[PDB]
Ligand binder design. Structure first.
Ligand SMILES: *[C@@H]1O[C@H](CO)[C@@H](O)[C@H](O)[C@H]1NC(C)=O
Ligand SMILES: *[C@@H]1O[C@H](CO)[C@@H](O)[C@H](O)[C@H]1NC(C)=O
Ligand SMILES: *[C@@H]1O[C@H](CO)[C@@H](O)[C@H](O)[C@H]1NC(C)=O
Ligand SMILES: *[C@@H]1O[C@H](CO)[C@@H](O)[C@H](O)[C@H]1NC(C)=O
Ligand SMILES: *[C@@H]1O[C@H](CO)[C@@H](O)[C@H](O)[C@H]1NC(C)=O
Ligand SMILES: *[C@@H]1O[C@H](CO)[C@@H](O)[C@H](O)[C@H]1NC(C)=O
Ligand SMILES: *[C@@H]1O[C@H](CO)[C@@H](O)[C@H](O)[C@H]1NC(C)=O
Ligand SMILES: *[C@@H]1O[C@H](CO)[C@@H](O)[C@H](O)[C@H]1NC(C)=O
Lengths: 414, 369, 205, 99, 49
């Protein structure tokens, strides 16, 4: 109170000093049951990937994503990310996602990086210098290799020019390495563009096959169809809590309700547009979000020159939420409920007043309106005064403010 | 509850304390108004057991102890008169029952003791004698009450009945009180709806800005919302200050009508209701007060020939109080607010000078008692 | 030829519960007392949004097609009825005037006179949405004077450009949405249960 | 920077001048009430109950005070009552007499 | 009436609507004042010849 009034003396009265506000006891989140998880693992577990010149593309859409289900597993020979760190991808939303997958020899896997030059990067799958995405790679010598060599896994050694960013191309032409007129047939200085690693199980690791998947993303003028996890918690009722329902964040007392939302309705509003109820996306419940309890705190004091004692009014609060006394004005705290009525010393509200009285304490009571006096009326009785008092009654009225003037140019600028 | 906004709001300095002080000033003044209107009584006077008021029937306006122990007419008034985004409403200091104790005390004083309880200790007096003083206060002589006491009682009782029917019949009559409730409902709802306004910011939902933007951008967008909400609140507080001055002008008028029309009888023409004033009874009503002003209205006139004075022995006689009138054949004097003929006599009249100077004098006799 | 719409073509503008209250909104809506086109058939424009209704006994109408082309170059939206349920696809078919017998480059797919059914078809740029209602009526071809609100069926996250539509094949009706203010009354149970077309006349205003 | 300080200081001065206009209107209501009490309670005798202080009014004396006026209202208050039997009129010869 | 400003002024919310309510309160009160001052008489009295 001293700091509220900017003074070391506080005169007798009641003063508002702060706002009481029940704190959120815990944090809650609700979103629908985990469904439409994106089929990244169904691509990763496909029976084989293509010859790297014609790498498989799977479009991914209309699904929730958690890429950490992928990159947390040390089962791959590598899992790396580019333009963005792996953790961040669980926050993001996209219009489309792509899984881009292929087979390469263990020595050439190095060509899968931003802005690379070399056979795979230039002629099979061009990652740009500003590539955002991830590269997943593992040895597949137990899956793809065969005795005498397997040829279902070719690479384009030769092309007219370097590919565009993420470009897929099925074009082929014979490479003229010398003076020979090749004219679309194999021969001397006339090399076939789709070279074979000829994968064999006995190979050294640099010649062995590696399966690879690369993750590629776009967010467009057409809105997102992919997003991060539908986060959720337990749903604690009948306490003040921080909450989130389907992205509607707030703080309040989550209470049961009989409010018959129609099947499509998600949120409820009161007359002044303020939210009053929500659907739990994990059940059939409609919960009324009653506002979290709060009110002004005011300090009742006798004048500090006479005593240092004080009492507190928690305005409109119930004493479940906060010597204690529940009243229609709020909780009195630190004042006696004396109930016997007296003249109103310090006003409080709804018929309560409080005073400092004798062994001395602050007391709170229903105010007296003055003494009762039954007038002795009857159809033939009159009272007449036999004597008088002259009286002198002081009355005081203000007449003038202090004449003040401000130069707005000198106050604003100066 | 944003800490980010709370820190930025400091840069506006005292405004957010000053506006809370300005509303606290208005709030305290409502208990000052309610006390200056109702708390004019010195002590809680009480109604006697036998309602022996000379034929008058206050049962509609006195407390009903079987019920908040209001009168019947106070109950009609309490029946016809008809979310927490940092706003708080506060209780009045006096409860509606405490107001009904003051309107009971003011009424029970006014019935049993005339004006005397407004000028000192209350003095009991019989009701048909109090009305004789109140008639004598409007130039109608005491005997015009006593010669008509049952008729005057039936007119008063019937007129109380017509008010009970009138207030029961329509909710449109209490316009002055219902408009106070409606204007404050519109002010508070408009102040709340302005939370949803964008004020040219990216969103009016603060949690959008607190999640979608970095601090250097979020500060600009929050400062737009603060500028908007702060200008909204200043406009509301300024309208409540002006409205509180408008209601204070009505509270000082009600306090003045309480002191003059209830605790007294006012000679201020057409102040305490239309007609000549006799008395008034306060009745409590939510956010206000109702006066039942009781007034005498003259209602069935006759024309007469009149003269400013009358001659006798060449000296001119003027009426002591009253007017000279004639039924064409005989001359009489009467009190001027009710036709009651008296024979013209030297105690009904006073001499001043001679028949020459008075314009429009007439002759006849003046009788000698 | 034309017919009076009375007070039909109101729909729930947002997924919000409200109770015993009046709420105001501006959106694309069918005006009160508007001339709907009377039918008992060809390709039609979409404008900014369509109202469609029919008095079919047993879901007789086979579906609808919507787009810019309704013939190749891009995926047109295709919608089909199977009893109480609906099949949806977007495809670049190029059929003649009998597309119901023509029966594709597709990029999205989904599955859900005693009676009258009403539908609203709406692009919102925040993708494409559908609203509807089903009611019994008197055995009359003209739309009866009465009130109910069309409820959201589906959101199609498809981004298809639409400027025309056609029906796949009783009395039926077409009208067009306009940007208008409406006052909407909600009962106790969250339900839009009366309305005012705000611009209709000085009393309504 | 100066435009922010202008807007802040200017809006703060607008608030002061607006609240001084409203406060000055309350002081005008008090100055008109004082001129009315001066005109009636001093220069006259107000027959208006509880206007010139409690009791029946006799006279009042104005005294100056810094920024205001103090009235010393002299009033008569009746003080020592006795009960009596009373009647509205009295007979003498079938004629009724009133005070 | 230049539309690019009106499309911004809608974003400022209730302000430009409540100012017409405030001035309507003032405008009605000018008739109420002039009614209470002059219309105290019960009939239109007119002076004899
Ligand atoms: C205060 O809260 C408790 C527990 O909810 C309840 O029993 C009591 O009736 C409440 N009292 C008031 C006056 O709100
Ligand atoms: C009221 O307070 C008095 C002391 O002032 C105490 O004796 C009495 O028991 C109280 N009564 C109730 C009903 O609380
Ligand atoms: C009248 O009252 C005064 C005090 O106010 C007292 O001094 C005086 O003696 C009293 N006179 C009579 C006749 O009672
Ligand atoms: C007075 O009025 C009441 C109704 O308020 C009525 O019942 C009663 O008979 C009347 N007369 C008396 C003398 O009470
Ligand atoms: C009074 O006299 C005038 C003139 O003779 C006449 O017009 C008027 O009606 C009379 N009024 C009454 C109540 O007799
Ligand atoms: C009254 O009026 C008539 C016409 O003006 C006139 O003849 C008559 O003498 C007047 N009487 C008096 C007393 O003025
Ligand atoms: C009154 O009577 C006298 C004679 O006694 C006469 O001279 C006078 O004119 C009369 N006056 C009037 C006003 O009739
Ligand atoms: C008047 O008489 C009544 C009944 O005897 C009594 O209650 C009252 O106190 C008396 N008052 C005075 C002033 O003696």
């Amino acid at each position: 109170t001293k700091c509220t009034l900017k003074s070391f003396t506080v005169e007798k009265g009641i003063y508002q000093t702060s706002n009481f506000r029940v704190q959120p006891t815990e944090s809650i989140v609700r979103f629908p049951n985990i469904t439409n998880l994106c089929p990244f693992g169904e691509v990763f577990n496909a029976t084989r990937f293509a010859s790297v010149y014609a790498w498989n593309r799977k479009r991914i859409s209309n699904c929730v994503a958690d890429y950490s289900v992928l990159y947390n597993s040390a089962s791959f020979s590598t899992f790396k990310c580019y333009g963005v760190s792996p953790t961040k991808l669980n926050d993001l939303c996209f219009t489309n996602v792509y899984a881009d997958s292929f087979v390469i020899r263990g020595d050439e896997v190095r060509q899968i990086a931003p802005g690379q030059t070399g056979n795979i990067a230039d002629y099979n799958y061009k990652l740009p210098d500003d590539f955002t995405g991830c590269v997943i790679a593992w040895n597949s010598n137990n899956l793809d290799s065969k005795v005498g060599g397997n040829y279902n896994y070719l690479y384009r050694l030769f092309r007219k020019s370097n590919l565009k960013p993420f470009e897929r191309d099925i074009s082929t032409e014979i490479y003229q390495a010398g003076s020979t007129p090749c004219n679309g047939v194999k021969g001397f200085n006339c090399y076939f563009p789709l070279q074979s690693y000829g994968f064999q199980p006995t190979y050294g690791v640099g010649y062995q096959p590696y399966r690879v998947v690369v993750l590629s993303f776009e967010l467009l003028h057409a809105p997102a169809t992919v997003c991060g996890p539908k986060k959720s918690t337990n749903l604690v009722k009948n306490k003040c809590v921080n909450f989130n329902f389907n992205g509607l964040t707030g703080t309040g007392v989550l209470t049961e309700s009989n409010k018959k939302f129609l099947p499509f309705q998600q949120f409820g509003r009161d007359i002044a547009d303020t939210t009053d109820a929500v659907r739990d996306p994990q059940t059939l419940e409609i919960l009324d979000i009653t506002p979290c309890s709060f009110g002004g705190v005011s300090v009742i004091t006798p004048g500090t020159n006479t005593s240092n004692q004080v009492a507190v009014l928690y305005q409109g609060v119930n004493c479940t939420e906060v010597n204690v006394f529940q009243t229609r004005a709020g909780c009195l705290i630190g004042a006696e409920h004396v109930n016997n009525s007296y003249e109103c010393d310090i006003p409080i509200g709804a018929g309560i007043c409080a005073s400092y009285q004798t062994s001395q304490s602050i007391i709170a009571y229903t105010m007296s309106l003055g003494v009762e006096n039954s007038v002795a009326y009857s159809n033939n009785s009159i009272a007449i005064p036999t004597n008088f008092t002259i009286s002198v009654t002081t009355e005081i009225l203000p007449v003038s403010m202090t004449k003040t003037s401000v130069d707005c140019t000198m106050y604003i600028c100066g | 509850d944003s800490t980010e906004c709370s820190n930025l709001l400091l840069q506006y300095g005292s405004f957010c304390t000053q506006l809370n002080r300005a509303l606290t000033g208005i709030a305290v003044e409502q208990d000052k108004n309610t006390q200056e209107v109702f708390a004019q009584v010195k002590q809680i006077y009480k109604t006697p057991p036998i309602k022996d008021f000379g034929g008058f029937n206050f049962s509609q306006i006195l407390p009903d102890p079987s019920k908040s122990k209001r009168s019947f007419i106070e109950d009609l008034l309490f029946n016809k008169v008809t979310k927490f985004n940092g706003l708080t409403v506060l209780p009045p200091l006096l409860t509606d029952e405490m107001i009904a104790q003051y309107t009971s005390a003011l009424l029970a004083g006014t019935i049993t003791s005339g004006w005397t309880f407004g000028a000192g200790a209350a003095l009991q007096i019989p009701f048909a004698m109090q009305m004789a003083y109140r008639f004598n206060g409007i130039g109608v002589t005491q005997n015009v009450l006593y010669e008509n006491q049952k008729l005057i009682a039936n007119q008063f009782n019937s007129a109380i009945g017509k008010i009970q029917d009138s207030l029961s019949s329509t909710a449109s009559a209490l316009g002055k009180l219902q408009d106070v409730v409606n204007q404050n409902a519109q002010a508070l709802n408009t102040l709340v709806k302005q939370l949803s306004s964008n004020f040219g910011a990216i969103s009016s939902v603060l949690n959008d800005i607190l999640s979608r933007l970095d601090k250097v951008e979020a500060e600009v967008q929050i400062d737009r919302l603060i500028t908007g909400r702060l200008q909204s609140l200043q406009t509301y507080v300024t309208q409540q200050l002006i409205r509180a001055a408008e209601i204070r002008a009505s509270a000082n008028l009600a306090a003045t009508k309480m002191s003059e029309c209830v605790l007294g009888q006012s000679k201020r023409v057409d102040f305490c209701g239309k007609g000549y004033h006799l008395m008034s009874f306060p009745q409590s009503a939510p956010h206000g007060v109702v006066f039942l002003h009781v007034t005498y209205v003259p209602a069935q006139e006759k024309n007469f020939t009149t003269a400013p004075a009358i001659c006798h022995d060449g000296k001119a006689h003027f009426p002591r109080e009253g007017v000279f009138v004639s039924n064409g054949t005989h001359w009489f004097v009467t009190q001027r607010n009710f036709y009651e003929p008296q024979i013209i006599t030297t105690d009904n009249t006073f001499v001043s000078g001679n028949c020459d100077v008075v314009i429009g004098i007439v002759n006849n006799t003046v009788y000698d008692p | 030829a034309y017919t009076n719409s009375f007070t039909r073509g109101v729909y729930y503008p947002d997924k919000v519960f409200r109770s015993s209250v009046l709420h105001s909104t501006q959106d694309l809506f069918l005006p009160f007392f508007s001339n709907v086109t009377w039918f008992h058939n060809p390709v039609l424009p979409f404008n900014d949004g369509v109202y469609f209704a029919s008095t079919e006994k047993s879901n007789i109408i086979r579906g609808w097609i919507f787009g810019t082309t309704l013939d190749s170059k891009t995926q047109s939206l295709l919608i089909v009825n199977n009893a109480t349920n609906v099949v949806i696809k977007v495809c670049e078919f190029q059929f003649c005037n009998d597309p119901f017998l023509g029966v594709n480059n597709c990029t999205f797919e989904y599955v859900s006179f005693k009676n009258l059914r009403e539908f609203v078809f709406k692009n919102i740029d925040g993708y494409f949405k559908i609203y509807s209602k089903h009611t019994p009526i008197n055995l009359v071809r003209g739309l009866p004077q009465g009130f109910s609100a069309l409820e959201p069926l589906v959101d199609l996250p498809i981004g298809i450009n639409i400027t025309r539509f056609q029906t796949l094949l009783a009395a039926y009706y077409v009208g067009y949405l306009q940007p208008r203010t409406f006052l909407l009354k909600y009962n106790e149970n969250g339900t839009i249960t009366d309305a005012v077309d705000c611009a209709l006349d000085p009393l309504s205003e």
